[PDB]
C-alpha cells in the first residue's frame, strides 16, 4: 500500500546510472517516440544480481512492447518502437544489492 514510483523523464539518447539498494527494488522512466523507429536499450548489471527490464508503449499495460534479456552483465533488446509514450521498468527481483547504467539509443 504506497505511492507509485515517480517516473524519471528521459529522450532517446539517453545514458543514465541507477541504483537498486535495499527495499528499492524498481526504478520507472518514461520516452515519448515521434516516429517509428528501431531503438536499442541496453542495462549494464554492475553487481551482476537478479534484476531486468521491461517496457511498456502507453496503451498496452499488460503485453511488453520489449524486454530485456541478458548477455552476461548486459540486459538488452532492439525492437522497432511506434509512436506514442513508453513506461520502462528496471527492477530487481532477488535479495542482491547493485548498481546500473541504463542506454537508450
Ligand atoms: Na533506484
Ligand atoms: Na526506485
Ligand atoms: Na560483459
Do not use: C
Amino acid at each position: 500500500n504506497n505511492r507509485p514510483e515517480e517516473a524519471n523523464r528521459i529522450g532517446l539518447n539517453t545514458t543514465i546510472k541507477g541504483s537498486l539498494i535495499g527495499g528499492d527494488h524498481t526504478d520507472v522512466y518514461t520516452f515519448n517516440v515521434a516516429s517509428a523507429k528501431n531503438i536499442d536499450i541496453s542495462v549494464l548489471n554492475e553487481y551482476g544480481i537478479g534484476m531486468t527490464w521491461v517496457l511498456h508503449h502507453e496503451s498496452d499495460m499488460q503485453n511488453y512492447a520489449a524486454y530485456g534479456q541478458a548477455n552476461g552483465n548486459h540486459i538488452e533488446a532492439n525492437f522497432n518502437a511506434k509512436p506514442g509514450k513508453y513506461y520502462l521498468y528496471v527492477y530487481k527481483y532477488d535479495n542482491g544489492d547493485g548498481t546500473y547504467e541504463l542506454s537508450v539509443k
